[PDB]
Design a protein around this ligand. Sequence first.
Ligand SMILES: CCCCCCCCCCCCCCCCCC(=O)OC[C@H](COP(=O)([O-])OC[C@H](O)COP(=O)([O-])OC[C@H](COC(=O)CCCCCCCCCCCCCCCCC)OC(=O)CCCCCCCCCCCCCCCCC)OC(=O)CCCCCCCCCCCCCCCCC
Ligand SMILES: CCCCCCCCCCCCCCCCCC(=O)OC[C@H](COP(=O)(O)OCCN)OC(=O)CCCCCCCCCCCCCCCCC
Lengths: 70, 171
Amino acid sequence: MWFEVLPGIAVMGVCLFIPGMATARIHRFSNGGREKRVAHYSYQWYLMERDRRVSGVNRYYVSKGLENID
Amino acid sequence: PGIVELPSLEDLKVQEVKVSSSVLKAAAHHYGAQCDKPNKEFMLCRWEEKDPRRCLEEGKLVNQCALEFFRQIKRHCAEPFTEYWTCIDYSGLQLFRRCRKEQAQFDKCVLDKLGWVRPDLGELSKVTKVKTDRPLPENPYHSRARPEPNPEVEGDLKPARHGSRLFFWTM
Ligand SMILES: CCCCCCCCCCCCCCCCCC(=O)OC[C@H](COP(=O)([O-])OC[C@H](O)COP(=O)([O-])OC[C@H](COC(=O)CCCCCCCCCCCCCCCCC)OC(=O)CCCCCCCCCCCCCCCCC)OC(=O)CCCCCCCCCCCCCCCCC
Ligand SMILES: CCCCCCCCCCCCCCCCCC(=O)OC[C@H](COP(=O)(O)OCCN)OC(=O)CCCCCCCCCCCCCCCCC
């Protein structure tokens, strides 16, 4: 009866689920298990490039805390 | 024109604050509370001298005070601070609103062991006053001597001598 439309809607829902889950896992993969740094403004980009300079390995996501100072 | 006068590389060497932006953002309010005076001396020197070459000693005092601030964090409250900046560091926009329990842990341990109070809403944006010992810059724009203006008009306005003097019009 009416539930016969549900395999097509289920396939369409999996096809809509794949881009978002995919880009969430990719942003966690390429950023050290965290969210991608959103730099919409120039101050956020300055902090981000400062992270890229202070990490030493040319990667902004390598976070350095209190262990990096004496 | 003149040769630009730069400081040497030994005038620029200072022990860096080699921490990330989320580490700086986590203890930002306690940094504004505790490292007020040399930071404001530096930014007053920076907006008054209008030259970063005139601000090197103030920047070195800023860097020394920030290093002493993070060493005073690390000796007493290193683990709640690490717990707090890791959770700040997770978010992309690095929200303060997402991490209020780690903030409460860090502020609790900081108030209990270091006596620091986190500032209220509105306090760090206040315009403060700075007691400096350096003299006020007499000409920070290096403006040369201004041109003397044109002479103004003076005297009572007498009538025109014999009218318009336009070829034959006697008035
Ligand atoms: C206590 C309170 C009471 C006090 C009361 C005192 C007054 C009592 C009397 C009451 C009435 C006052 C009238 C005005 C004062 C006298 C002005 C005068 O004669 O100046 C001499 C003036 C200069 O001669 P001046 O010997 O060196 O001066 C003697 C005084 O010191 C002149 O004095 P100024 O040195 O101080 O003059 C200054 C300067 C002196 O002048 C100059 O420095 C030289 C330059 C003047 C203009 C030149 C322009 C040239 C190119 C254009 C030409 C246009 C076409 C010509 C006309 C075509 C036909 C319309 O004047 C001008 O530049 C003004 C422009 C010209 C207008 C003159 C006054 C007209 C008033 C009546 C208008 C009626 C229509 C007249 C016809 C229209 C054309 C004038 O003569 C001319 O320029 C010759 C042109 C004709 C002048 C008009 C004569 C006025 C009476 C007309 C009555 C008849 C009208 C007929 C019907 C209409 C036409 C069909
Ligand atoms: C993001 C997810 C996207 C998913 C998209 C797809 C959704 C549907 C998923 C599959 C649903 C079931 C598909 C069944 C296909 C039909 C199979 C069939 O009946 O084949 C019979 C035909 C003839 O067989 P024969 O040997 O002659 O039979 C005589 C028997 N005595 O035999 C043949 O024609 C030969 C065998 C053909 C097999 C075709 C299988 C289906 C192919 C569809 C393309 C997409 C598949 C999924 C791809 C993504 C996942 C890997």
